[PDB]
Structure formats: C-alpha cells, structure tokens
Design a protein around this ligand. Structure first.
Ligand code: NI
Lengths: 88, 88, 88
C-alpha cells in the first residue's frame, strides 16, 4: 500500500534533519539516498519534493554548526534529489 | 470550487509569514493549524507543501529577530503540517 | 514530451541560483519569470514548486553577499511564483 510507504519515506526525511542536528552526517546522507531510491522506483515525486525541503533544513543545521564538510555531503544528496525529481 | 479553496489556503500561508514578521506568532500558529485542517479535509497535498515552504520562511524571520520561543511554536506547527502531508 | 519539458524547467530553476551566485541578479529575475510563464501555460504546478524552492536558495545566496536590492528583486519574483502556483 503506497500510502504506508509515503508515511515511511516522510519519516526518513524528517530523520535526515534530526541526524544533521546530531552531526551524524553520513547516516543522514544514507537515509536521504534511500528516500531517493525508494521514491524513484515507486515513482513518487511528492516524497522527493518533501525530501528536498528537509535537505534544505539539514543544510541550515550544518551551516549553523560551521560544518562545511557536512554541508558538502548534504548538498550532493540535494543535487541527486533534484535530478531524480526532474525525471519524475 | 476547489481552485477557490486552494487560493484561500495559499493566502493564509502567506499571512503566516507576514504575521511572523510582525511578531504575531500565536495568530500565525492559528492560521497554520487552519490551513492544515482545511487542506486535510479537502485532500490538498500541494496546499500543505506550500504551507511548509512558508513555515520555513517564518522561521527565517523569527531567527533574524532572535525570537526562539516563536521559532519553537512555528516548528511545532511545522511538525503537524509534515504529519498531515504524510497522510495526503 | 512531458518529461523533457519538466527537465528543462528544472535546469532553468537551477540556473537561477547559478546566476544569483555569480552576481547576475537581473538575468536570474528574467529567467525566473520565463519559468513562471512556461510552467503556467503548460499547467506545471510541480515545476513552480521546484522554482520556489530554488528562489529561496537564491535569496540565501544574495543575503550571504549582503545584497539587499537583489534580495528584494528575487522575492518579488517569488511572490509572482506563489500567485501562479495558487492558480495551478
Ligand atoms: Ni532557508
């Protein structure tokens, strides 16, 4: 049921922000890639759009802590989500 | 018709930002809950997506003013809107 | 055909941020307007959502250079995008 799946992808995206605030940047990246992959297979653009919103919030959190490396990492996942969004 | 409701909810979403700018955070919270309720009963996904965009702008405005209690209130309503978007 | 056009407008919204970053505000404004117009004619609400996301990124960039005029210009383009989105 794709609606249970939408809820699952939404929760993963929110945890991306939570983990950026914690400095667990690689884990947040992992969660965002799994949102992208799962959303591109099941063709759900709105899950990707929400992911992009949340990725912007994670950039906020990392800038606030002056972590440029984490910002780079998050921004790579951002560009990937933008490509996948365009194709959906 | 449903176009009228979509524009109305967009209007309320913009006012949330203006109210946040003027320090009227309780009122902005109230308008934001209203947007969630109406879009949720009309199944308007993009209405909530737009509201989320505007809630981020309201957080920007309250950070500029160093109003962290306001930021908390807005983020509480943001969490609620995110929840509704998952179910939509 | 739909995916080709959606992809072109994704790239245009990205080039908006590029041109803001390189300090070409006028050029970003005009590209943003062209995106709104084409998106509107074609009924492409998701393209306008993505454009709004990128215009907020353009604001981020311009406030980073402390360029208040450019910000005002980009934010009125944002207001145009928000209205068109309301009617889509
Ligand atoms: Ni922002």
């Amino acid at each position: 049921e794709a609606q249970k799946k939408k809820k699952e992808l939404s929760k993963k995206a929110q945890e991306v922000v939570e983990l950026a605030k914690e400095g667990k940047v690689d884990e947040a990246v992992e969660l965002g890639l799994k949102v992208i992959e799962e959303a591109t297979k099941l063709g759900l653009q709105d899950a990707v759009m929400f992911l992009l919103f949340k990725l912007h919030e994670a950039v906020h959190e990392l800038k606030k802590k002056g972590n440029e490396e984490g910002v780079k990492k998050i921004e790579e996942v951002k560009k990937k989500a933008e490509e996948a969004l365009s194709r959906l």
